[PDB]
Structures are given as structure tokens and as C-alpha cells.
Design an enzyme around this catalytic site. Sequence first.
Site, PDB file in Angstrom:
ATOM      1  N   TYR A 148       0.822  -1.179   0.000  1.00  0.00           N
ATOM      2  CA  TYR A 148       0.000   0.000   0.000  1.00  0.00           C
ATOM      3  C   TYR A 148       0.850   1.219   0.000  1.00  0.00           C
ATOM      4  CZ  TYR A 148      -4.630  -2.085   0.622  1.00  0.00           C
ATOM      5  OH  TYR A 148      -5.798  -2.740   0.354  1.00  0.00           O
ATOM      6  N   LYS A 179       2.031 -15.373   1.397  1.00  0.00           N
ATOM      7  CA  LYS A 179       2.337 -16.096   0.181  1.00  0.00           C
ATOM      8  C   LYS A 179       3.825 -16.436   0.129  1.00  0.00           C
ATOM      9  CE  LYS A 179       0.878 -17.960  -3.690  1.00  0.00           C
ATOM     10  NZ  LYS A 179      -0.054 -18.997  -3.994  1.00  0.00           N
ATOM     11  N   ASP A 193      -4.207 -17.895  -1.003  1.00  0.00           N
ATOM     12  CA  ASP A 193      -5.134 -18.573  -1.874  1.00  0.00           C
ATOM     13  C   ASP A 193      -5.891 -19.709  -1.202  1.00  0.00           C
ATOM     14  OD1 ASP A 193      -2.564 -19.891  -1.967  1.00  0.00           O
ATOM     15  OD2 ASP A 193      -2.850 -20.426  -3.988  1.00  0.00           O
ATOM     16  N   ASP A 207      -6.718  -7.108   3.529  1.00  0.00           N
ATOM     17  CA  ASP A 207      -7.795  -6.449   2.773  1.00  0.00           C
ATOM     18  C   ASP A 207      -8.750  -7.478   2.170  1.00  0.00           C
ATOM     19  OD1 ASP A 207      -9.183  -4.149   1.458  1.00  0.00           O
ATOM     20  OD2 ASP A 207      -8.312  -5.043  -0.440  1.00  0.00           O
ATOM     21  N   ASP A 242     -12.637  -8.910   3.875  1.00  0.00           N
ATOM     22  CA  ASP A 242     -13.892  -8.779   3.095  1.00  0.00           C
ATOM     23  C   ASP A 242     -14.573 -10.166   2.913  1.00  0.00           C
ATOM     24  OD1 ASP A 242     -14.059  -5.984   2.890  1.00  0.00           O
ATOM     25  OD2 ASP A 242     -14.064  -5.912   0.745  1.00  0.00           O
TER      26      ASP A 242
HETATM   27  C1  LIG Z   1       2.459 -23.221  -5.594  1.00  0.00           C
HETATM   28  C2  LIG Z   1       2.271 -21.721  -5.898  1.00  0.00           C
HETATM   29  C3  LIG Z   1       3.626 -21.088  -6.234  1.00  0.00           C
HETATM   30  C4  LIG Z   1       1.201 -21.564  -7.009  1.00  0.00           C
HETATM   31  C5  LIG Z   1       1.007 -20.084  -7.324  1.00  0.00           C
HETATM   32  O1  LIG Z   1       1.035 -19.237  -6.438  1.00  0.00           O
HETATM   33  O2  LIG Z   1       0.784 -19.711  -8.515  1.00  0.00           O
HETATM   34  C6  LIG Z   1      -0.116 -22.224  -6.719  1.00  0.00           C
HETATM   35  O3  LIG Z   1      -0.823 -21.610  -5.612  1.00  0.00           O
HETATM   36  C7  LIG Z   1      -0.989 -22.185  -7.937  1.00  0.00           C
HETATM   37  O4  LIG Z   1      -2.182 -21.645  -7.814  1.00  0.00           O
HETATM   38  O5  LIG Z   1      -0.579 -22.888  -8.957  1.00  0.00           O
HETATM   39  C1  LIG Z   2     -10.838   1.880  -0.148  1.00  0.00           C
HETATM   40  C2  LIG Z   2      -9.569   1.007  -0.090  1.00  0.00           C
HETATM   41  C3  LIG Z   2      -8.332   1.875  -0.345  1.00  0.00           C
HETATM   42  C4  LIG Z   2      -9.545   0.244   1.259  1.00  0.00           C
HETATM   43  C5  LIG Z   2      -8.291  -0.622   1.333  1.00  0.00           C
HETATM   44  O1  LIG Z   2      -7.863  -1.205   0.342  1.00  0.00           O
HETATM   45  O2  LIG Z   2      -7.687  -0.775   2.437  1.00  0.00           O
HETATM   46  C6  LIG Z   2     -10.773  -0.570   1.549  1.00  0.00           C
HETATM   47  O3  LIG Z   2     -10.936  -1.689   0.641  1.00  0.00           O
HETATM   48  C7  LIG Z   2     -10.725  -1.088   2.956  1.00  0.00           C
HETATM   49  O4  LIG Z   2     -10.841  -2.386   3.131  1.00  0.00           O
HETATM   50  O5  LIG Z   2     -10.795  -0.188   3.899  1.00  0.00           O
HETATM   51 MG   LIG Z   3      -2.726 -20.881  -5.963  1.00  0.00          MG
HETATM   52 MG   LIG Z   4     -11.052  -3.587   1.453  1.00  0.00          MG
END
Ligand SMILES: CC(C)[C@H](C(=O)O)[C@@H](O)C(=O)O
Ligand SMILES: CC(C)[C@H](C(=O)O)[C@@H](O)C(=O)O
Ligand SMILES: [Mg+2]
Ligand SMILES: [Mg+2]
Lengths: 364, 364
Positions: free
Chosen positions: B143, B193, B225, B249, B253
Amino acid sequence: SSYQIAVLAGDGIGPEVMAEARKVLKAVEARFGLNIEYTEYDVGGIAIDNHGCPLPEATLKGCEAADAILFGSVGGPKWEKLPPNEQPERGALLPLRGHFELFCNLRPAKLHDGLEHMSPLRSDISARGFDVLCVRELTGGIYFGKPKGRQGEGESEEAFDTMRYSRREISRIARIAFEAARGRRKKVTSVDKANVLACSVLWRQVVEEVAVDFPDVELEHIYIDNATMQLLRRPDEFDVMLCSNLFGDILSDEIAMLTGSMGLLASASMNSTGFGLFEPAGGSAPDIAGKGIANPIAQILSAALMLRHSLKQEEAASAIERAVTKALNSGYLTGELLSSDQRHKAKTTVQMGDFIADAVKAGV
Amino acid sequence: SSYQIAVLAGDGIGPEVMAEARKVLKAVEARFGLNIEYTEYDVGGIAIDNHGCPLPEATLKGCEAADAILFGSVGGPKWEKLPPNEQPERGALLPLRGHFELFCNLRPAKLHDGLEHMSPLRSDISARGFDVLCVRELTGGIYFGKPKGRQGEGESEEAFDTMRYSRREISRIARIAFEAARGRRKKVTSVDKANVLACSVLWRQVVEEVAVDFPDVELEHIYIDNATMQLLRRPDEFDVMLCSNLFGDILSDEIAMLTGSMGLLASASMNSTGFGLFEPAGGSAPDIAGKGIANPIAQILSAALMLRHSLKQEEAASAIERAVTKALNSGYLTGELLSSDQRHKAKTTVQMGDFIADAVKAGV
Ligand SMILES: CC(C)[C@H](C(=O)O)[C@@H](O)C(=O)O
Ligand SMILES: CC(C)[C@H](C(=O)O)[C@@H](O)C(=O)O
Ligand SMILES: [Mg+2]
Ligand SMILES: [Mg+2]
């Protein structure tokens, strides 16, 4: 003449599901008179054990000599304690994607008829169904940007990664997503964080530029945080999601989990010349390897994608795809696809591949 | 003596829900003999209209003169077409967080009794319930890292953002997460990650360092992920999630949407000296402003967090919190909390705030 496939089955369930995919491929080869030769190469954990690294030079070379890579799954608890740069999943996948310029990652995900109850979605939401293709940029962004690393010591030690994208990179992956939507429900949702990231601002801008070539396709943009929320509540309203490397990583997994049936999901990672890497969306699942319980469909469908995208064998691809449909509507389901009521109807990995291969042979 | 609050209600439903929060605060002020003075300042869209930018100097100064910022919600279609650096949400929030060193973002999210059916989770999963606190680092990472921007032209034009974290930054947010888990179910899940990002490798390492001070708290790590998948399938198994700026973030959500009741969710963004910004988790919801339908609970609970974390008025905070509980179990629900069967029992924004304030006054 003879296509050449580098088969990189990897760890855990990789080899047991690959066997099935090869079986199903043999049936297609016979049906459509395809001449495909395959060579197996170690990758991931098995390559660390046999060669000392996750992507041996001879494996990489084997992939260079091939028309496509049919890839299983990498990683396992055995190697989990290695340093990051030695670990088998990143150590197999990222250098493959980078070395072959596999910029396009396609992860189709649909809620299958009769498998709604497996979806973690509320029943009314799973009943609506969904089919969402994630198109993720795979060779750029923060995965491969520089500078990357760390400096300093103690409390002031810092590490860093650079998310970078050029217009050219964004436009080529955007074009894939639009072309794909043109064949589907004609909507691209581009996922970014343009309110925060300079990379995302360029993303959004360039995706809008590419859109001019696709007047027939609706473009909308969504923030990645908001996208995680909307896919949960209304995944029926998405068609193609177009994402940067990290954002598509995240979203494709979410969407896959929303199906409730990750063992069905395959993926294609493609360069601009039609070479690619085809692999299931799910991991090496070491918890279940060697027991004949693993669902081989995602691997089988990875072979179908391979046929379509790399080998230009659309009929063969579709035949596999129909044979998998036939399994799923003919009571041939592995145990993880079934509710506890029904789990005693579970088919083994070999039963599934035998069924599917037989369906292909029978003319499905 | 007299606490001083900067009230930055913003756009859309911000002002209608803030009115309620102020109402509920008046009741607490009377109950517990608190002397709090408030001053309103424009922020977001309303500040663009009235002052030409989303965070006027006089608003920032007002916040400097305060003990806390009680913040509503920023943004709306009116300003959606501005350039990124002029838009009201990022333009209000990030400079506030950066200027006051609000490194800690707390977003508690629970599935409330009797509101399972609103959760987009499958019913058996919503029935299990969940309470997940996301602890997100808010002043670092991608950020605010540099370099950030773009260079070049045409196809070779590139944009870039740098994800950077020092040990000190990681350790201070980790400590919050562990301390919070010590008060909860004693589990921190750290989300990163680390298989890809150098920043994440340091994250994971330093979180493990901080853990030594918390032998009572279970630490586990998960990839972002994979985390999006696990929160969907088994959110009951998480307690505190500890995340970098971008990863929190995203995850906060997702988790909020999994409640099905975002109008109930508040958040606190805190510096190390106890000053903070307290705001609902949900947006300015311009679609519903001015109609008296908006759920004011998230704003009311933002005021409770303000009392607890910035003003050190734990009793007052908890009173608000109990009054909101009482509303929710006494048939005082806004329309978005109700199923279609029941939506004619919907209370208006003012009815809700009157109820809650009355519950506080009555000694709940
Ligand atoms: C293993 C990892 C490096 C890989 C990625 O982050 O792309 C996996 O999560 C994917 O979705 O194939
Ligand atoms: C509006 C945006 C910049 C903000 C962020 O990314 O932090 C929002 O998504 C949050 O979760 O407060
Ligand atoms: Mg992945
Ligand atoms: Mg947000």
C-alpha cells in the site's frame, strides 16, 4: 507427425491420477488416430529425492522437447520444512511458467449438475449454478518482478517484492479473457486493486483499451476484496474473470472451492505459440495417495485441455470431456463427490479411469 | 478531562448511520458520566464537493486535535469517474492511516445467533457458526511501499508497486494478533504467500519469532489462496487471522461476506499510542442513503470500539455492544437482516438507534 508430451506427475496423488489420464488418452489416441508419445520426468518432491532439486535440468530439457507438459501435482509434508527457494511446488511451477513464457492461466470452474450439495454455498445460491473461467496472468506481476529479496538486519531488516506490469503484458492476457468471453456469456470482469496500486491503474486502463476490439463483450471492473465477496454471494453473475498473477491466484482458488468439487477442475497454462502446462487445480493431497481413492477427473480433464490447446485436437478433447460427463451422470463418482448417505457408492481411482476410457472407446 | 472526537461521516449512508451512533454515544455518555465532545469534518466525496479534495487540511488537523476518529463511509458514483489519486475512498483512508501511523486494523466478524440463514454458507456450515478476527497490517506492505508509479510509453509502459515489510513492522502487528488470540481461542493463523514472495518469507519468519512470547497460543500459517478456500469451507476453525495489508484487505472482506450480515460489522484502525479510526466494515451504500433503511449497527459498534480502544472506556463500549445484542434478539432488525418471509418487520435506521440508545439508558 507424432506429438511428444512431457509427463510430470510429481508427488502425492499425482502419479495415481496421471495413470488414469494416460489411460483415457490411450482411448482417445485409438479413437481419433492420434500419434502421441510420452516421456516421464521427475518434478517436485520426487525430483528433490531423486536429483536434489525440484526441477532437474533433464526435466526442463524434456519439457523443451515436448509439445506440451501434462503435469500432476507437487509438494508434500516430506519437503515442507525446506527453505522457500528449495521447496517443490514453487520450485517446479514458477520456473516452468517463466521458462516457457506461460503467461496465460485458464481455470474453468463450474458447479456440476447433481453436485450442488457439495458446494459450500447456501443451497439457493448453489441451485442457481455457476460457470466462471478465471483467466490469470501467470508470468508477470509480483511473482516475477524485480527487485525481489531482502536487505538489512535486525529490526530494520526488510524484504520486498515488486508488482510490475507493462501494457504489452496486460493487453495479451486481456485479449485471452475477451476472446474467451466472446465464446461464453460475453462478460469480462477484470479484477484489480486500482484504488491502491499503480500496477492496477495500468491494468484497468489497458484492459479498457483492449475492450475496443470486443464491442460484443461487456467489461466491468471490480476490486479484488469486493470480488471475494461477490463470488460468494452471486457467482452466477460472473462469466470470465480477468486477473493479475496474485489476484488470479487468490480468486481462482476461491471459485474452485465454491464448486465443492475441486477434483473435477483442470487448468491450462499457455504461451503464445500453443505450448502449455496442463494440471489439475487441486494439490498433491498426500493424505490420500496410494489408496485408490483420489479423483482422477481433474487430471483426465487436464489431458483434455492439453489436446485442445496444445495439440489442436478439439474432437479428442471434447470426447474426454463427454466421457467425464457420462461418468458423473452414470453413478461413477469418487468418494469425495458423494454425501455421507451415498459414500458407499464411491468408485476407486482405477474404476473411474476405466469408465471414462471405456466411454471414449464406446463413442461418447 | 473531555475526550475530543473527530467525526468524519462521509458519503452515502455515512451521515444517517452516524446520527445513530452519536445517539447511542449520548446514552453511554449519560450512563457512565463521560465527557466527550465531537466536531464534524468533511471527508471523502462530500469533501471533494465542499473543499476540492477528499481529505482537507482542516479535516486532517481536526483529526490531529482528537483522541479518535469516528469515521463513516466514503465514496459514491458521483466521484467514481475521477482519477485514482483524486478518488474519495483511497483519498480519505490511506492518508489518514498513514498520517496517524494506524498500523493495526481489527475487523471482528461473527455469525450472529439467529442470522445463519443470511450467511451465503451452506446451512450445515453456517450452523456451526464462526467468530474470526482479522488482524491486518495497515500502514506498510504494497500500500505504501516505494517505488510506486509508472515509467515508459506505449507497449513498454510499465507500472509498479513495491511490497515491503521490515521485521519491526511485522512483529508489531503479529504481537497484536497473538495478544488478541490469547483473549479468544488461542489460535493465530498467519496468512501470507511465502512460497512466492520475499516479503512473505520475512513475514512468516518474524511471526514465528513473536510466537516465542506466546507459548499458550497456537500458530499456523496458510497461503492466502488456500485461506480463501478454507474460510469458505471451515470458518469455525479460525480464531485470529493475521495478515499483511493486501492479504488482510482481501480476507477481511471475504470473512465479512461469509457472515451474511455486513451491516453488523465494525472495525478499528489503531496506532501504538491508542489513537484510532473506527468505521464500519461496509461501504457508503449510496443505493440506499436518505431512505432510513440503512443498518446503523456497524456504525454504533464502531463507536463502541472507539470507546474501548481509544478512550479506555470498556464499560461504555460493552454497554453499547449489549444494547446491540438486545436489539438483535428483541425483533429490532433492519430489512437486510431479514428473510423475505419476515421483511415487513424491518425497522428503520432511526428505530434501531432509538432502541439501542434506550437499551443503554435502561441499564443493559
Ligand atoms: C504453488 C504456488 C507457487 C502456485 C502459485 O502461487 O501460482 C499455486 O498456488 C498455484 O495456484 O498454482
Ligand atoms: C478503499 C480502499 C483503499 C480500502 C483498502 O484497500 O484498504 C478498503 O478496501 C478497505 O478495506 O478499507
Ligand atoms: Mg494458488
Ligand atoms: Mg477492502
